[PDB]
Design a binder for this molecule. Structure first.
Ligand SMILES: [Zn+2]
Length: 141
DNA sequence: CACCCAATTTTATTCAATG
DNA sequence: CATTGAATAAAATTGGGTG
């Protein structure tokens, strides 16, 4: 329910801003609503990802996102740590937008990746941003 | 534990065709 | 003139392995 609450909140935002994105503004009511549902559900799923997400935990740092910087340790006289190189300091892998793209092709079969990049992905990215911007949208819920 | 690197995937962009 | 899509290169990630 908290998940459904968050998704509906995102969906209201998405409907509000949908007019600004050529790939969705043109879509018919029901198809448009389903495309927005896909985009919001995937954006929220990505926002909620962590090292506890099955399969996501970085293999090299085991989720800490940290690793000793041996060159700096040797030249600075103390143990210095850097961001883990494999996960770029996150500790876990993200869900690429390509997953939402493939999900959306089930509703827009002729959607190509370049046209997705130009005309639909910006809405997806905006929904991810909105997840980060809204405190009420919880990453642990 | 942190690294290496080929293989693979993601991503935006070039260039030519469309309309 | 804007838009699109095949192709492509840069960047990100994965798989298999090591010192
Ligand atoms: Zn890591």
């Amino acid at each position: 329910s908290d998940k459904q609450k968050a998704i509906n909140y995102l969906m209201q935002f998405a409907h509000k801003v949908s007019g600004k994105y050529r790939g969705v503004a043109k879509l018919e009511g029901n198809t448009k609503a389903k495309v927005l549902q896909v985009l919001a559900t995937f954006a929220y799923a990505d926002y909620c990802r962590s090292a506890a997400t099955p399969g996501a935990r970085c293999r090299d740092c085991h989720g800490t996102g940290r690793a000793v910087d041996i060159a700096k340790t040797k030249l600075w006289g103390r143990v210095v740590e850097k961001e883990c190189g494999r996960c770029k300091g996150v500790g876990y892998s993200r869900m690429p937008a390509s997953a939402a793209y493939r999900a959306v092709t089930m509703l827009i079969p002729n959607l190509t990746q370049p046209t997705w990049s130009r005309t639909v992905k910006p809405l997806y990215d905006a929904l991810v941003v909105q997840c980060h911007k809204e405190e009420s949208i919880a990453d642990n819920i």
